Short mmCIF file of C-alpha atoms in Angstrom, two decimals:
data_model
loop_
_atom_site.label_atom_id
_atom_site.label_comp_id
_atom_site.label_asym_id
_atom_site.label_seq_id
_atom_site.Cartn_x
_atom_site.Cartn_y
_atom_site.Cartn_z
CA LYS A 1 143.28 96.82 116.63
CA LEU A 2 141.93 93.95 114.05
CA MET A 3 142.28 89.64 116.01
CA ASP A 4 142.56 87.00 113.13
CA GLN A 5 139.61 84.65 115.30
CA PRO A 6 136.96 87.61 115.66
CA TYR A 7 133.96 88.22 118.71
CA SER A 8 131.35 85.99 117.29
CA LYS A 9 127.50 84.92 117.89
CA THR A 10 124.22 82.84 116.53
CA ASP A 11 120.88 83.06 117.11
CA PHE A 12 117.91 81.44 114.61
CA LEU A 13 116.01 84.17 113.90
CA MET A 14 113.64 85.36 110.76
CA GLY A 15 113.93 81.37 110.61
CA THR A 16 117.06 81.29 109.41
CA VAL A 17 120.18 80.47 111.64
CA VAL A 18 121.91 84.68 112.04
CA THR A 19 125.76 84.95 112.69
CA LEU A 20 127.23 88.54 113.48
CA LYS A 21 131.05 88.35 113.77
CA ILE A 22 133.32 91.47 114.70
CA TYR A 23 137.21 91.67 114.51
CA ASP A 24 137.95 94.73 115.32
CA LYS A 25 139.27 93.86 119.12
CA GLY A 26 137.49 95.95 121.57
CA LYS A 27 134.56 95.48 120.12
CA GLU A 28 132.82 92.70 121.54
CA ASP A 29 128.85 93.94 123.33
CA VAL A 30 128.51 95.49 119.34
CA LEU A 31 126.77 91.79 119.71
CA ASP A 32 124.80 91.90 121.11
CA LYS A 33 123.98 95.97 120.22
CA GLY A 34 123.59 94.28 116.68
CA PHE A 35 120.99 91.23 117.72
CA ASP A 36 119.15 94.05 119.48
CA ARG A 37 118.44 96.15 116.05
CA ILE A 38 118.11 92.90 114.05
CA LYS A 39 115.54 91.09 117.39
CA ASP A 40 113.69 95.20 117.88
CA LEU A 41 113.51 95.10 112.80
CA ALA A 42 111.96 91.58 112.98
CA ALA A 43 109.71 91.69 116.14
CA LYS A 44 108.27 94.77 114.01
CA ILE A 45 107.95 93.65 109.93
CA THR A 46 107.74 90.15 110.70
CA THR A 47 103.86 88.46 109.66
CA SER A 48 104.83 85.28 111.25
CA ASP A 49 104.07 85.34 114.89
CA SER A 50 100.67 83.46 117.40
CA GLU A 51 100.76 86.50 118.93
CA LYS A 52 100.06 89.78 116.58
CA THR A 53 102.30 92.23 118.06
CA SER A 54 103.71 92.97 114.93
CA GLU A 55 103.08 96.34 113.02
CA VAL A 56 102.43 94.97 109.83
CA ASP A 57 100.04 92.71 112.35
CA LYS A 58 98.61 95.62 112.56
CA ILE A 59 98.43 97.32 109.34
CA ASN A 60 96.77 94.23 108.66
CA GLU A 61 94.32 93.86 110.86
CA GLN A 62 92.70 96.82 109.55
CA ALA A 63 93.23 96.62 105.67
CA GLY A 64 90.05 98.18 104.22
CA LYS A 65 88.88 99.85 108.37
CA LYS A 66 91.30 102.61 109.86
CA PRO A 67 94.95 104.21 109.29
CA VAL A 68 97.46 102.52 111.72
CA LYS A 69 100.47 104.82 113.21
CA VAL A 70 103.37 102.55 112.60
CA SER A 71 106.98 103.73 113.49
CA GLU A 72 110.09 105.38 111.15
CA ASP A 73 111.59 101.74 111.07
CA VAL A 74 108.17 100.07 109.54
CA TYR A 75 107.33 103.68 107.35
CA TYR A 76 110.54 103.81 105.89
CA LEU A 77 110.49 99.76 104.75
CA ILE A 78 107.08 100.16 103.31
CA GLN A 79 108.08 103.13 101.22
CA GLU A 80 111.01 101.90 99.97
CA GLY A 81 108.77 98.11 99.50
CA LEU A 82 106.05 100.33 97.70
CA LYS A 83 109.29 100.89 95.18
CA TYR A 84 110.39 97.40 94.98
CA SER A 85 106.90 97.40 94.61
CA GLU A 86 106.87 99.85 90.75
CA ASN A 87 109.44 99.31 89.58
CA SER A 88 109.42 95.77 89.63
CA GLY A 89 107.77 94.72 86.01
CA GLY A 90 104.72 93.91 87.62
CA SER A 91 106.78 91.11 89.27
CA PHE A 92 107.31 92.35 92.91
CA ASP A 93 104.17 93.75 95.50
CA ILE A 94 104.62 94.38 98.70
CA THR A 95 100.40 92.92 99.20
CA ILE A 96 101.13 89.77 97.95
CA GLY A 97 100.29 88.81 101.67
CA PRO A 98 97.33 86.82 101.22
CA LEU A 99 98.46 84.72 98.32
CA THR A 100 101.54 83.92 100.61
CA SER A 101 99.17 83.47 103.67
CA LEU A 102 97.85 80.73 101.36
CA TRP A 103 100.29 78.45 100.12
CA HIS A 104 102.53 79.05 103.51
CA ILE A 105 106.11 77.92 101.69
CA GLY A 106 109.08 77.69 104.70
CA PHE A 107 106.29 77.12 107.21
CA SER A 108 105.57 73.11 108.59
CA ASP A 109 102.25 73.48 107.23
CA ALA A 110 103.10 75.03 103.26
CA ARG A 111 100.29 73.01 101.02
CA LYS A 112 98.85 73.60 97.96
CA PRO A 113 96.13 76.08 97.59
CA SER A 114 92.66 74.78 95.06
CA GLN A 115 92.20 77.02 92.01
CA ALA A 116 89.17 78.76 93.65
CA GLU A 117 91.94 80.31 96.76
CA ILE A 118 94.03 82.16 94.16
CA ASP A 119 91.21 83.05 92.68
CA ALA A 120 89.87 84.58 95.60
CA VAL A 121 93.24 86.92 96.72
CA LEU A 122 94.27 87.73 93.00
CA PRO A 123 92.56 89.82 92.74
CA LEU A 124 93.56 91.55 96.44
CA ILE A 125 97.12 92.12 95.41
CA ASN A 126 97.86 95.87 93.96
CA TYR A 127 101.05 97.92 95.52
CA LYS A 128 98.56 100.80 94.17
CA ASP A 129 96.09 100.55 97.28
CA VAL A 130 98.62 101.42 100.12
CA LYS A 131 97.71 104.72 100.46
CA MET A 132 101.00 106.77 103.17
CA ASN A 133 100.12 109.45 105.51
CA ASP A 134 103.40 111.27 105.68
CA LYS A 135 102.54 113.96 108.27
CA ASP A 136 100.58 110.98 110.53
CA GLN A 137 103.01 108.77 109.86
CA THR A 138 99.91 105.88 108.84
CA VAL A 139 99.78 103.43 106.68
CA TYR A 140 95.91 102.62 105.58
CA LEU A 141 95.35 99.04 103.07
CA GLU A 142 91.74 100.06 101.31
CA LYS A 143 90.41 97.23 100.80
CA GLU A 144 89.28 94.18 103.53
CA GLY A 145 91.46 90.68 103.13
CA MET A 146 94.39 93.26 101.79
CA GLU A 147 97.66 92.51 103.47
CA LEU A 148 101.22 93.48 103.53
CA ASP A 149 104.17 90.43 103.96
CA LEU A 150 107.89 92.66 103.68
CA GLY A 151 109.29 89.64 104.17
CA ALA A 152 111.49 89.86 100.33
CA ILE A 153 112.52 93.14 101.88
CA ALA A 154 112.84 92.31 105.56
CA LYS A 155 116.60 90.76 105.33
CA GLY A 156 118.31 92.99 103.47
CA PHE A 157 117.04 96.03 105.69
CA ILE A 158 117.86 94.75 109.10
CA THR A 159 120.82 93.90 107.32
CA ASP A 160 122.18 97.43 106.57
CA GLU A 161 120.56 98.90 109.69
CA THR A 162 122.95 96.15 111.54
CA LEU A 163 125.86 97.56 108.84
CA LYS A 164 123.99 101.44 110.61
CA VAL A 165 124.97 100.34 114.51
CA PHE A 166 127.91 98.54 113.52
CA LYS A 167 129.30 101.98 111.80
CA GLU A 168 127.73 103.98 114.54
CA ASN A 169 130.10 101.76 117.20
CA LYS A 170 133.77 101.84 115.02
CA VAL A 171 133.65 98.80 113.57
CA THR A 172 135.23 98.09 110.46
CA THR A 173 136.19 94.48 109.83
CA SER A 174 132.86 92.57 110.32
CA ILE A 175 130.77 89.68 108.31
CA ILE A 176 126.58 90.32 108.97
CA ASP A 177 124.99 86.79 108.10
CA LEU A 178 121.88 86.92 107.98
CA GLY A 179 120.86 83.37 105.25
CA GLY A 180 120.09 84.38 102.24
CA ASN A 181 122.23 87.84 103.32
CA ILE A 182 125.46 88.23 104.29
CA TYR A 183 127.44 91.46 104.09
CA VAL A 184 131.26 92.08 104.33
CA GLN A 185 132.81 94.52 106.32
CA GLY A 186 136.64 95.38 104.97
CA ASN A 187 138.79 93.61 104.31
CA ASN A 188 140.13 89.96 105.81
CA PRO A 189 142.58 91.00 109.28
CA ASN A 190 145.32 89.47 106.40
CA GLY A 191 144.53 92.26 104.03
CA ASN A 192 142.80 90.31 101.34
CA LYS A 193 139.28 90.94 99.99
CA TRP A 194 136.96 88.27 101.85
CA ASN A 195 135.76 84.68 99.73
CA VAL A 196 132.36 85.81 99.87
CA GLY A 197 131.19 81.86 99.07
CA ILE A 198 128.21 81.68 96.15
CA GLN A 199 125.59 79.66 97.40
CA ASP A 200 124.98 75.59 95.81
CA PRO A 201 121.06 75.84 94.13
CA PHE A 202 120.95 72.41 94.49
CA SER A 203 122.15 71.92 98.12
CA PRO A 204 121.13 72.59 102.37
CA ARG A 205 122.41 77.08 102.25
CA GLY A 206 125.92 76.85 103.50
CA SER A 207 127.37 74.26 100.74
CA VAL A 208 128.69 76.96 98.14
CA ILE A 209 130.11 76.50 93.87
CA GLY A 210 132.72 79.39 94.60
CA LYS A 211 134.09 82.26 95.57
CA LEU A 212 133.65 86.21 95.10
CA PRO A 213 136.34 88.73 96.39
CA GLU A 214 133.93 91.16 98.49
CA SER A 215 135.13 94.23 100.42
CA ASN A 216 131.80 96.30 102.28
CA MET A 217 129.21 94.50 100.11
CA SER A 218 126.64 92.76 100.31
CA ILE A 219 125.64 89.96 98.60
CA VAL A 220 121.99 88.28 98.32
CA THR A 221 120.92 84.69 97.33
CA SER A 222 117.81 83.51 95.96
CA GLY A 223 117.35 79.68 94.63
CA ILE A 224 114.76 77.22 93.97
CA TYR A 225 115.19 75.24 96.30
CA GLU A 226 116.18 78.43 99.27
CA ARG A 227 112.27 77.78 101.08
CA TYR A 228 110.01 75.21 99.08
CA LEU A 229 107.17 73.12 99.07
CA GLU A 230 107.37 69.46 97.60
CA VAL A 231 103.43 67.93 96.43
CA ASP A 232 103.21 64.94 94.25
CA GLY A 233 106.71 64.50 92.78
CA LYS A 234 106.55 67.79 92.17
CA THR A 235 108.89 71.31 94.10
CA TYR A 236 106.69 74.76 94.55
CA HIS A 237 109.68 78.05 95.37
CA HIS A 238 108.87 81.00 97.24
CA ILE A 239 109.27 83.23 95.31
CA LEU A 240 105.18 83.20 93.64
CA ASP A 241 104.14 85.29 90.50
CA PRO A 242 101.47 88.35 91.80
CA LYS A 243 99.85 87.91 88.72
CA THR A 244 98.59 84.60 88.32
CA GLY A 245 99.84 83.00 92.02
CA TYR A 246 102.02 80.14 91.17
CA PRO A 247 105.81 80.20 91.44
CA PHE A 248 107.98 81.95 88.34
CA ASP A 249 109.52 78.46 86.97
CA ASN A 250 112.68 79.09 84.38
CA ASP A 251 115.34 78.33 83.79
CA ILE A 252 117.05 80.11 86.97
CA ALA A 253 118.00 78.05 89.42
CA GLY A 254 120.62 80.73 91.35
CA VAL A 255 120.49 83.94 92.49
CA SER A 256 123.29 85.78 93.64
CA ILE A 257 122.82 89.93 93.28
CA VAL A 258 126.16 91.76 94.27
CA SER A 259 125.56 95.85 95.51
CA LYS A 260 126.36 97.91 98.22
CA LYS A 261 123.39 97.68 100.11
CA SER A 262 121.64 94.50 100.73
CA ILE A 263 118.14 96.49 100.61
CA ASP A 264 118.74 96.69 97.61
CA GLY A 265 119.62 93.47 96.52
CA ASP A 266 116.90 91.85 98.14
CA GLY A 267 114.63 94.33 96.08
CA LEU A 268 115.05 93.72 92.30
CA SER A 269 115.83 90.31 93.56
CA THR A 270 112.85 88.95 92.37
CA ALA A 271 112.09 91.02 89.57
CA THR A 272 115.67 89.35 88.56
CA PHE A 273 114.66 86.32 89.07
CA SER A 274 111.10 85.95 87.08
CA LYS A 275 112.68 87.33 84.09
CA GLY A 276 115.53 83.85 83.48
CA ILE A 277 119.07 83.69 83.07
CA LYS A 278 119.16 86.32 79.67
CA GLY A 279 116.76 88.51 80.68
CA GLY A 280 117.65 89.16 84.25
CA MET A 281 121.38 89.52 83.28
CA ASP A 282 120.24 92.33 80.78
CA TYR A 283 117.50 93.55 83.91
CA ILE A 284 121.00 93.99 86.22
CA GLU A 285 123.34 95.38 83.35
CA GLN A 286 120.51 98.52 83.61
CA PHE A 287 121.22 98.91 87.26
CA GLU A 288 124.65 101.61 88.16
CA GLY A 289 126.39 98.84 90.61
CA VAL A 290 124.52 96.20 90.79
CA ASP A 291 126.09 92.58 89.04
CA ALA A 292 125.16 89.63 89.21
CA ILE A 293 125.98 85.60 89.23
CA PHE A 294 122.90 83.24 87.91
CA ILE A 295 123.13 79.39 87.56
CA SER A 296 120.59 77.70 85.30
CA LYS A 297 118.93 73.95 85.48
CA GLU A 298 121.54 73.02 83.20
CA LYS A 299 124.80 73.70 86.07
CA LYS A 300 126.03 76.64 83.56
CA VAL A 301 127.02 80.04 85.43
CA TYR A 302 127.51 83.68 84.04
CA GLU A 303 128.65 86.59 85.48
CA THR A 304 126.77 89.89 84.47
CA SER A 305 130.08 92.35 82.50
CA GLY A 306 130.51 93.74 86.77
CA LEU A 307 131.90 90.44 87.65
CA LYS A 308 133.86 89.40 83.96
CA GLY A 309 136.48 87.50 85.73
CA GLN A 310 135.70 87.77 89.37
CA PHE A 311 134.35 85.06 90.62
CA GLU A 312 136.24 81.55 91.08
CA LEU A 313 134.50 77.88 90.44
CA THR A 314 135.01 75.89 92.89
CA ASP A 315 132.66 72.17 92.41
CA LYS A 316 133.15 70.50 88.51
CA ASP A 317 129.72 69.77 88.26
CA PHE A 318 129.25 73.45 87.09
CA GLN A 319 131.23 75.03 83.71
CA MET A 320 131.39 78.77 83.39
CA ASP A 321 128.89 79.98 80.30
CA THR A 322 129.17 83.18 78.13
#
């Protein structure tokens, strides 16, 4: 029924290595159904495509001109993005596109823009200027020059949509790894909870400071070195402040947000990160069913109340703290 050695499939999509693993015997073809669904969604959502076929590219091209018809998946993701933007501190806005386009952090052409370039795009960022029409399933950016960027919640949504394809196909036991988003379904076939690696924010992706046992759970990782630009001594990470055009800089090196849904982990990441360690920990403590591990720039590790005594530290360069 459950195999020790899973069916596995790896691809490089959305600038990340993506691995799916299914441990249910006779479910090998679901790997392709999962990757079909991931590729379908990425093509609709991405603003990183030369070809400009994406639904989000089409919305952006018609900013201030006319509403754009979108599929149900894109309309839903924008509806969810606007909710996360509203709920955030003024810290998360899906209309941050004109600023994230300018820096292009994590692309070969990433650049620190001039203050004059930043000042030209700050007035274009306002999630309240996205007009949704449910009846027509249209999205309208109300001013010329506005741009959506769904990159901060796209992998979370796509992770939740892959799980949905797994469950439709009666998959019980699997790991969905989209880079900074992991979902662990069921338990290890040996009957233990899955041991999820907590990212070392000071090291390349897949380096870990310890393990958190989990079943049926999302872990979403954010970090100061996950996607950054190094210029002239200094580091500019990708979590930009929409009010200033510069990165949020505080005592956080990394956060791992634990929740039932990957899109909520993504959806809360920016707001949480913007508040620093004490403020971010206070913030996660307001959400039922959400916990986090925070790692400071001084290599201290904090758990929120729902994870007390659950994280297993395996890196002696780090110290548990309260």
